[PDB]
Structures are given as C-alpha cells and as structure tokens.
C-alpha cells in the first residue's frame, strides 16, 4: 500500500482503539446493576428451591 | 424442571422464526464460504460476495420458515385440543418438514421423509 | 495512550501480514509487529524479553522466513484470491471471538477508573526491595537453571530434533 | 502460587496462596475455605477494591 | 486500565493469526505465518500475566515457548521446501492428492 | 373436604416466585405511609395472573 493509506489506517485503528476504551469504561460502570441483577436471580432460584423443597 | 419462560404463543411463533432465520442465515455463511468459486468468476471479486450473500438469504428464509411453521402449528395443535403431550409438535414438525421441506425440494417422497425424521427428531423431544 | 498507539500499529501491520499480496512483504510487516511487540515488552519493564524478541523472532525466525520465500519466487497467480466473499464468514466470527475474548478479563479484572483526583499520592513506598535490585536476566537466570532445569533440557532436546529434522529432510550433498 | 517475585523477592500473593492452601490440607468441606480463597484472588486481581473505588468515583459524578 | 490494554494488544494479534488462516485458503505460507502470529500473541500473555500477578512462572514458559516456536518454524519450512521441490509449485491444487 | 382452586393456588407459587418476590418488595417500600397514597396492586396483579394462569388448566380436571 502507499505510505499515505498506511497512516491512514493507523489513524483509523487508533480511533477504535480509543472507542475501546470508552467501551471498556462502560463496562466497568456498570458493575453495580451486574451484580445486583446476578443476586436478585440468585434470590428467585433459592426462594423457588426452598418452596419446591417443601413438598 | 420447565418453570423457567413467560411464554405466549404468537411470541413464541415470532421468537422461533426469529431464531430460525439467524440459523439459516449462519449456515448459509457457512455452506458459501466451503464451496469454491466457479473458473469464470476468480478474477472479480463483487459476484462471491453477492452469491454469499443469496446463499445466507435463501437458508435464512428457509430456515425461518421451519422455525414458525414448526412451533405455530404445534401450539395450535396443542391449543385447539389443550393437551400437552410430545403428540403435539410432532404434527407441527412433520408439516414443517414436509411443506417446506418439499417446497425447496421439489418433491413429495422428499416432503415425506422430511417429515417423517421431523417428527421422530421431536417425539425423542 | 501510548499503547492504543502501538495496539494501532500492531493492528494494522497485522492486517498487512495476512492481507499482502506478495509473500515477502507478509514477512516484512511481520518484522514491523515484532518490533512493537518489544516496544509493549519495554512498557512492560521487561527489556531481557523485548531484545529477545528482536534477537530471535526478527534476528533468526524472520530471516529464515525471508530467505526461503525470496528464493521461491512465487508468482501472484499461485496464491491469489479475491477475498470480499469471505467478509461474512470473517465478520460472524471475529464478531463472535471479540464479544467473547477481548472482555473475558472484565468480570476477573475490573479496571480502576481514573479519578479527579489524586490517588497517586496513595502510593506507598517499601525501601526493602530497593537495597539491591535484581534485573529481569538475573531473576530468570535464577531459575532457568537450577529449579526447572528438567524443561530447559527439554527444550534442548526439541532444538535437536530440529536440527536432525532439517538434515534429513532437505540434505542432497554434493 | 510459586513465591517466585519478578523482582527476586517474594511474589505478592504467596503468602495468601499458601494459607488458603494449608487451610485446604485439612478441612474436608471447601467451603470451609473460602474467605482465604477469595483473599488470595482478591491479591491476584484486586477485583473488589476497585469495585469499590469505583463506587465511590459513581457517587462523586452523580453529586457533581 | 492497564491491564486490560495489554491483553486486547495480545487479543488483536490472536484474531489476526484467526482471520488469516480464514482468508487464505490459497496461500498457505501465510497460513504458516498465521500461526507463528497466534503463537506470539501466546507468549505476550504468559509476560503480562507474569507482570500482572508478580510470579515469576510466566517468563520460563515465555522463555521455552520461544524455543518451541523457533523449532516449528524451522520443521514447517523444511516440510514447505520439499513439497515445492516435488511439485515444482505451492500452489493448493497440487497438495490435494489425499482425500476421502 | 378441602377446596381444590385454594391447594392449587398453593402448589403455582414455585412457578411465580418472580412476581411473588416483587410484591413483597412493593410492600417493603410503602410501609411508610406517605398520606396514604403508595399501593401495590400492579405488583398484586402480576403475581395473581401468573398463579391464575397456572391453576385455570388444572383446576377443572379435579372438579366433576
């Protein structure tokens, strides 16, 4: 390839690297909601369990 | 054991097709990218592409289709009765198979013996 | 910063590598993702293993490489092929790989977000370690040798039937 | 695990390592080891204390 | 975020050495390379894994894996040339033989 | 004897834990009173719809 469409391509993969970063700051910010929705599930297994385990 | 869904019939009838055409669609990919390209059509690169993309339409329509027309007449079989049994699905599997099936294969022994491993396929289900 | 710039010119000699046309420039853009491989080894503190990499991969693998693909002259005709039917294929599973393989470490490993403020004054400092500093050779070469010798000898034995190998296969004496 | 640091001292995480695993040596149950478990990953991936500090940089952008 | 940049670099090399065994059905010198691609990607992981959890075992197998890599690339371009010398090329259609 | 709708009702409930964990979570927050104006019959509604639909099929099977 030319010179110019290699920096080009450069300038293009540094930009979807930066958009990775805003990627991976999204995931990290949405921990908190991850983890209360896992334990909120959690909970309806075992209240579901424990009802079932009844009979 | 099955407690698990919040079901709907008319959802489950759009949700199955959906399914269905995102399997077709990837075994259409699939299928494209094994074979090989015909002698006359090496040097030009947009007619692969436009065949690979026919070939994920086609199987993804197909596909599509076996994916509602199986779980659509299962439910209207096991609605219009209310029994729930693998009787149910079996019908709906074997008219999927067989109409499709015969439809793409042009065929009615083909439709046939769609249907046929359709229906042992749901009733091991 | 400086690693999403490297990670861009990594990922684009890396597409030049499977994506060149003529086979010699695939090795020449290998040698490039080389070299900033050890550039990321430098970042990394670990300077043993970024010379390594240019003494080894560029300094004997790559000219290996070069020298057997030059003198095979390979025309484009042998090798060629339009790849647009194949973006698809590429796309589903790069797709597929990327959801599921460049964030398997976020639930393990989840980043520090950078504050506005300052947490580097947080860094406590142990003069212990400092006395004597060992370098990354001398904290391999403690090992290497002594305590897992077993798999050094290993590796000897592999290079031997490299060695052998090569001979037996390509040898016409004159 | 190994106790090998990279700077020729003791790794960071040995010290967990080894007291998850003499409590393994002799408790028949695994979950009788788990608080020193989660220890010795918590030092290998400091996953909690980040979650937390993330907590506390979540508070200050929602009051800010 | 460090460690997690580190990882998407070895990532990227990985899915690289993927894409080009799936891109080059014809060049199978590229495929070779491909792998030697994979296998880097490999190695940069045991390093900042090593770095990461201060452990010392990562570099060794860093160390070995550089070795296994020299000797396969040694062999695989010894097979290379004695296909070429039979056939007289590299093209696939003349490795096909074998099949069924 | 002993109503067959009322044991039914009792042996769905495994199949709407759901609903029935996020009724008694409404209830929880409006404890307070608030002028009397916090319910929860969206919260009931669910959680009978799910338990009606599961006892409807059942039921007649058991009456004559």
């Known amino acids: 390839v030319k010179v110019l469409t290699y920096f080009g391509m450069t300038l293009a993969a540094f930009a979807f690297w930066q958009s990775m970063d805003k990627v991976h700051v999204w995931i990290a910010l949405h921990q908190d909601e991850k983890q209360e929705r896992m334990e909120k599930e959690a909970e309806v297994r075992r209240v579901r369990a424990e009802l079932l385990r009844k009979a | 054991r099955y407690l698990e869904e919040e079901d709907g019939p008319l959802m489950k009838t759009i949700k199955g097709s959906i399914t269905g055409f995102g399997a077709g669609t990837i075994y259409g990919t699939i299928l494209a990218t094994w074979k090989d390209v015909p002698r006359v059509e090496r040097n030009v690169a947009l007619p692969g592409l436009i065949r690979t993309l026919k070939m994920m339409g086609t199987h993804g329509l197909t596909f599509a289709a076996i994916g509602g027309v199986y779980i659509g007449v299962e439910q209207l079989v096991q609605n219009f009765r209310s029994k729930r049994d693998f009787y149910n699905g079996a019908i709906g599997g074997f008219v999927a198979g067989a109409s499709v099936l015969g439809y793409r294969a042009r065929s009615i022994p083909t439709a046939i013996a769609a249907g046929a491993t359709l229906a042992v396929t749901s009733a091991l289900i | 910063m400086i690693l999403s710039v490297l990670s861009s010119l990594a990922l684009v000699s890396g597409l030049m590598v499977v994506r060149a046309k003529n086979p010699v420039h695939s090795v020449l853009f290998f040698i490039l993702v080389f070299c900033d491989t050890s550039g990321l080894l430098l970042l990394l503190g670990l300077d043993f293993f970024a010379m390594i990499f240019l003494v080894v991969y560029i300094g004997a693998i790559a000219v290996l490489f070069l020298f057997v693909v030059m003198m095979f002259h390979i025309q484009i ?64 070469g403690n090992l290497l040798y002594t305590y897992y010798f077993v798999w050094f000898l290993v590796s000897s034995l592999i290079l031997l039937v490299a060695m052998i190998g090569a001979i037996v296969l390509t040898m016409h004496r004159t | 695990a190994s106790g090998w640091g990279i700077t020729g001292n003791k790794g960071r995480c040995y010290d967990f390592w080894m007291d998850f695993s003499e409590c393994m040596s002799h408790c028949r149950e695994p979950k009788d080891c788990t608080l020193l478990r989660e220890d010795y990953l918590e030092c290998l991936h400091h996953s909690k204390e980040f979650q937390r500090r993330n907590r506390i940089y979540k508070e200050e952008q929602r009051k800010l | 975020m460090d460690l997690i940049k580190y990882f998407t670099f070895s990532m990227i090399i990985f899915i690289l050495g993927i894409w080009g065994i799936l891109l080059n059905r014809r060049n199978i010198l590229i495929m070779l390379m491909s792998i030697e691609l994979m296998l880097l990607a490999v190695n940069l992981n045991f390093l900042v894994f090593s770095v990461s959890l201060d452990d010392m075992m990562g570099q060794v197998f860093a160390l070995l894996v550089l070795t296994v890599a020299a000797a396969e690339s040694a062999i695989g371009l010894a097979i290379f040339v004695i296909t070429f010398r039979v056939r007289g090329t590299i093209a696939v259609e003349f490795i096909n033989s074998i099949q069924g | 004897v002993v109503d067959p709708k009322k044991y039914l009702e009792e042996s769905c409930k495994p199949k709407c834990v759901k609903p029935l964990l996020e009724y008694q979570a409404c209830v929880k927050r409006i404890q307070g009173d608030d002028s009397g104006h916090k319910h929860c019959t969206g919260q009931y509604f669910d959680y009978w719809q799910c338990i009606d639909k599961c006892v409807a099929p059942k039921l007649f099977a058991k009456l004559k």
């Open chain 3, 77 to 140: 005709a042998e090798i060629h092929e339009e790849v647009l039917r194949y973006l698809p294929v590429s796309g589903i599973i790069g797709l597929i790989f990327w959801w599921e393989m460049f964030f398997i470490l976020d639930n393990e490993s989840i980043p520090l977000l950078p504050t506005q403020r300052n947490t580097t004054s947080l860094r406590y400092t142990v003069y212990a370690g400092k006395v004597r500093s060992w370098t990354n050779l001398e904290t391999l």
